[PDB]
RNA sequence: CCUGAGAAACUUGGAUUUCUAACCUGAAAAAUCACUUUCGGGGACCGUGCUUGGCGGGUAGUUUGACUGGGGCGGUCGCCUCCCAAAAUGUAACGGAGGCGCCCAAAGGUCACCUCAAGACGGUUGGAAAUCGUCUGUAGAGCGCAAAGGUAGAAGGUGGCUUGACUGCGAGACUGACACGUCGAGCAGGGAGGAAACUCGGGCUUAGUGAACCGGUGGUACCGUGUGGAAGGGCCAUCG
RNA sequence: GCGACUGUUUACCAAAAUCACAGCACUCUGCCAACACGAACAGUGGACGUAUAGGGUGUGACGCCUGCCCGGUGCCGGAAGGUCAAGUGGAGCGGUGCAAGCUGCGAAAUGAAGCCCCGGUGAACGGCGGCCGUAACUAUAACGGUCCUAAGGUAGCGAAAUUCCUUGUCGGGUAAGUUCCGACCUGCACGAAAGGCGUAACGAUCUGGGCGCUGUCUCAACGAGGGACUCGGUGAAAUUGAAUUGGCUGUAAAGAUGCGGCCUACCCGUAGCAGGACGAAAAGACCCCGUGGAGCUUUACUAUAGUCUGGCAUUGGGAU
RNA sequence: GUAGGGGAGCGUUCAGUCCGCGGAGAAGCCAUACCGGAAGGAGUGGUGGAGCCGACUGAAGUGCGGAUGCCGGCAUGAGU
RNA sequence: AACCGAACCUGGAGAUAGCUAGUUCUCCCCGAAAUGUAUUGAGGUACAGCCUCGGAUGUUGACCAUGUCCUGUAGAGCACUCACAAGGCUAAAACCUUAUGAAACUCCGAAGGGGCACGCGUUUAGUCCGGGAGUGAGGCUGCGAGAGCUAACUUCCGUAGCCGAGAGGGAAACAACCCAGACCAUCAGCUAAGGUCCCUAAAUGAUCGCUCAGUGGUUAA
RNA sequence: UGUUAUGGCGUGCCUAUUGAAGCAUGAGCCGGCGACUUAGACCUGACGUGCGAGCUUAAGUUGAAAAACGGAGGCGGAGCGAAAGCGAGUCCGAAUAGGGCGGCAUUAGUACGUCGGGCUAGACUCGAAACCAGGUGAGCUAAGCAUGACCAGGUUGAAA
RNA sequence: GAAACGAUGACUGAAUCCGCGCGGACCACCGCGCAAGGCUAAAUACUCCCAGUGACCGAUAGCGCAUAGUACCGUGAGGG
RNA sequence: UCAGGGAACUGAAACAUCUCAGUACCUGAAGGAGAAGAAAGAGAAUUCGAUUCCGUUAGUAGCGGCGAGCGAACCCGGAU
């Protein structure tokens, strides 16, 4: 039947034009005070995998977003 | 960080501005006692000086 | 009887590698914010093209090519200078 | 019309006390029953219906880590340093030592200035060592703690002013399977010390840490369901 | 030695020291009794019984007896206070429309049992224990005994069904006794109804010694009967890679008839032996592994029958 | 050359279609020294008694020595 | 109701089974992995690493010389650090002559090793993108070390080769050792390790010797 | 060609493994049955094909020894952000400097089909111990209840 | 969960037209609506049975059965 | 087919919410079918207009130890 979505990732990861697949930077509620400066404003943003880790995601979702 | 430190507490720093702002560290309390005066930044104007927020 | 032991130890314990030693050497290019050496201290000194973060790494100020020198032994330094 | 109050009256409740026609219960020519009556007593309590918290191995579902010269016991589980590691990075062992889960409002930024451990002689308390003096004196010291590398043209010791322990970023590289992690010129807004060229987005460095998730809090006005509002949610911040 | 006794018990490896018992003891229970089966206000057992009765629990005739600790747990009782749920009450907060207003949120005080807390309770759960130093090489046969939790063993027993050291020391029996009996006491680690110590009698119990008798034995013999063997009749089995299946040394995954070398050995069978074929039998029941299982346990987690408890409905009048 | 990926094919049935055989004898079975690089496939002889080969194409319950595999038959042990 | 710590029958049901077995036609080409990193994970899964197919690219691969920087092992040394042999000398500590040991000592310090460049001279691979995987238990000798007892068919790393996945000759026999990588055919020739009295192919060879012990044909103070 | 003597040579097969003739697993023999599949108009690829900045139907309808109709929806068309929105641009920001994107120095899709993989369902076949529901059993055994039955002969010698 | 609405077990049980109910808390606005009374063919599901077909089977196949729930086992359910 | 009752194994690589699934099974009633049905409705166009069915929207909106996994409807085309 029809290929589930993986709503674990509607919010998570994103398609492009390439195909690539993005995603964010991680530490941004506890790992806080720490900082440092560059180290929190880094992580508020959003990233490209690395590859090998990527087609996984791609299965998650068929439409793309 | 580590709940039942009394040294060292981590306390934030309100602006004096209003802007709706702060930043945010440790004194030791062995040392202020009543609060701190530190001249930071403000992206919402430009440098406004900030006492130690409750 | 047989044997119960009981000894244990109290060692066994090590930190995962810090990869130091010289990274870029010495005749090699160089692109700018390229990195040529980690290391601990001042084991390799500052020269004229290159910068130190507070690692002591050593990265590259501008482009070009790398040059060695150790000051007769104990003192020692890394240039850059371009390719003219 | 009343500040305080007295009779009456509606009383709406709280308690005990009592009464019985609910309801429970027994006996009498009709056994379980149902009449009818003496009714005998019980009596708004019990019992039962819904919710409230407690108790509850009586019953019911489960959890109970791994390494490991078998398993158990003991020891170990993340991070740092040093050998082991065969002159590049890397590398195991229940191999050999040791350290971290903080500290610092100055121990940071800048500016300026000072030089160390010891031994010899000689010196009031002292007299192995204290303080001062001179000759020696490249490290035989110091760096908040672990050691290694590092350091005297300072990172070491002392003062002046200070909040770069700063938002918006990120050329280019180190590193890792991934996720992380590490360094960084330079640009902007806007500052700090210098007279300046400058230097600074934490400390000589490498330990001083916890991904998501759910939630607290300070902004923010992107979403808000016929519409405009508010709940709630998102984003930056951040706390557990 | 153990139990008192007659009894009971693991159908198909355990008959006893199990269990039951008469006896005693603690508690619970006043009748629609507790307690138990139960869709359940049914109906039933308890019981057509009534505290000299009924339930539950423990010890286990009888005889002398049954001590010390109420701090923790449990249980019984106590009440000043700490308290605690829904409900009662809402000051105050805010959302909205111009609005009468609709509404989101929600604090005081009050408020059930129960727990905290105070005391009592052992024929309730239980408790009745740590240690001191010795000449030498980082050590062995041995020491006499002062004693922190609530207390730290009264009687009786004690090398025992309990004893680590262990064949303890002594005595008896024996020619000789790790066993057994008596005493001893340094009880690793007895002890009073989880009974203590005894005891006639009882026992297909257990333990040692004796007398008697004996092929149990020294050491086996002869005999008998039923098999085994032979012939005629009927004729299974488990096993089975395939075999044309020796021995010694060696090699090989380390236990070779199959490889090496060397020895020995003509073909077949019959009655017999049990060394080998890691012989057959059941994919080991021990051990490790599985984020396998099931039984059981509790102060591991979560619920929950049940049960206590406030409010609500059945549910009413009145007197103060 | 093991796990593995790739390439070309052999055989079995059912099916569409054509070549076509068969009581002067089909399939199946039995023997053999022929052919193909191999899965395989031909010649002839004996069996049998009424159906079948070949080419191309399509679709599969499509190829067995193992599973202490399942059904059935017959061996060993034994004239014990 | 012939095996009760939870009857038997039917059913959910083909529960699940990180486990064990088993998995059939043929030829050809390539051809691994038992390493890392995490994991209630350790005989299991993810990603890399390694195979293969195919599309791109163009010699980027590969070995080897050169040139060029990085290093702190082997040895060595005593200059700090701990150790320690004799002697001086003083009030022993220092310090002098003489003297030595070191994984966590280093005035010194190779052989090698690695990065970059060149290709000055050879050879073939490399790299990217996309499909399919499997493997993730390794084993032995040689040289390096650790734990051991300078024990092990020992274990845990490193490193080369080999078996794994390797037939053929040799080592009597013998995964690992020495030679060597089997496309078919041949009653054809030369060699390797290893051999040449007979078993058993090939000199009972040649010359200068040794041992007389069956050493050869298993050990030491 | 069948058979044979003599020679040389030679460690069954499978599975499981670091390593199998193994004294490690399996199996007496021969037959026959016996295991990588199917579904979805899902995903993603390779080959192929038909139309090609275009490609395509589904349910159905009608006819049906055949197939045609059926645009409802699907895929391509433009990206970027958290979103509003902006758009060959967008986002973070106050602009810079950047991630994503368009151009790019260039390139095509879609529907069918065959196949290599994927997912959800038993998913290669066989194998549990267990778990739950509904029922069948006391003609065995454990006992209860009502009712009948049964114990040669002998010994001992209580109360009263 | 911001929990609307329906739905009922126990407590409460409003308006009837200038009224009632909903629009996913809640408010105004503005929209869609007539609770408390009933029946209803049609298309749809199944297939013991009847018929037609088949790239379904032909005697270990095919239902379990070329027939039989019989022989046989089971106290029974049930297996077969 | 409708209704009262309502499992577990399983999966989440452990389990408890959760998933298995209102599935298996039990029961009640009824028919040749049944159920549902004539709007206090969907809804967002001031549009549709009883139901059941198929296609589709659509693995989209959303649900969730936001984990495993679970998953609509309006519109649009048909059946009637
Ligand atoms: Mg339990
Ligand atoms: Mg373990
Ligand atoms: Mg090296
Ligand atoms: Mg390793
Ligand atoms: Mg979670
Ligand atoms: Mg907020
Ligand atoms: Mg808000
Ligand atoms: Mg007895
Ligand atoms: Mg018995
Ligand atoms: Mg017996
Ligand atoms: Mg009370
Ligand atoms: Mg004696
Ligand atoms: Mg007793
Ligand atoms: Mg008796
Ligand atoms: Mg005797
Ligand atoms: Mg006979
Ligand atoms: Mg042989
Ligand atoms: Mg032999
Ligand atoms: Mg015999
Ligand atoms: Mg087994
Ligand atoms: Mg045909
Ligand atoms: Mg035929
Ligand atoms: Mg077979
Ligand atoms: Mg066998
Ligand atoms: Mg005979
Ligand atoms: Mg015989
Ligand atoms: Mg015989
Ligand atoms: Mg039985
Ligand atoms: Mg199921
Ligand atoms: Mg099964
Ligand atoms: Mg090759
Ligand atoms: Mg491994
Ligand atoms: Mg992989
Ligand atoms: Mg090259
Ligand atoms: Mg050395
Ligand atoms: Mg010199
Ligand atoms: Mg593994
Ligand atoms: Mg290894
Ligand atoms: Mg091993
Ligand atoms: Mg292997
Ligand atoms: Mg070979
Ligand atoms: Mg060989
Ligand atoms: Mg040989
Ligand atoms: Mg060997
Ligand atoms: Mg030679
Ligand atoms: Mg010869
Ligand atoms: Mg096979
Ligand atoms: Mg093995
Ligand atoms: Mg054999
Ligand atoms: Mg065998
Ligand atoms: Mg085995
Ligand atoms: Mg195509
Ligand atoms: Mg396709
Ligand atoms: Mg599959
Ligand atoms: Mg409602
Ligand atoms: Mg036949
Ligand atoms: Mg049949
Ligand atoms: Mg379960
Ligand atoms: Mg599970
Ligand atoms: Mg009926």
Redesign the pocket.
Known sequence: ????????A???I???????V???????????????????????????????????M??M????? | ???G?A??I?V???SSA???????????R???QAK??????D??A??VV?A?AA | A?K?????????????????????????????????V????????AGQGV????????????DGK?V???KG????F?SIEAAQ
Request: charged content about 30%; glycine content about 14%.
């Open positions: 039947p029809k290929m589930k979505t993986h709503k674990m509607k919010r998570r994103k398609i492009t034009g390439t195909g690539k993005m995603a964010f930077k991680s530490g941004k509620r506890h790992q806080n005070t720490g900082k440092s400066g560059d180290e929190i404003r880094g992580k508020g943003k959003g990233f490209v995998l690395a590859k090998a880790e990527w087609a996984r791609k299965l979702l068929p439409r793309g977003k | 960080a580590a709940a430190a040294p060292r981590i934030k720093m309100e209003g802007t709706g702002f702060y930043y945010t560290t440790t004194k030791n062995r040392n202020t701190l005066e530190l001249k930071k930044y992206p919402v430009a440098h900030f130690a | 047989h119960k032991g009981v000894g244990s130890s109290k060692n066994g314990r090590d930190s995962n590698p810090k990869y130091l030693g010289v990274k870029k050497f010495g005749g090699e290019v160089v692109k700018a914010g390229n990195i040529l980690r290391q601990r201290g001042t084991k390799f000194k910068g130190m973060g507070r690692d002591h790494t050593l990265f590259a100020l501008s790398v060695f020198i150790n032994k104990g003192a020692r890394i």
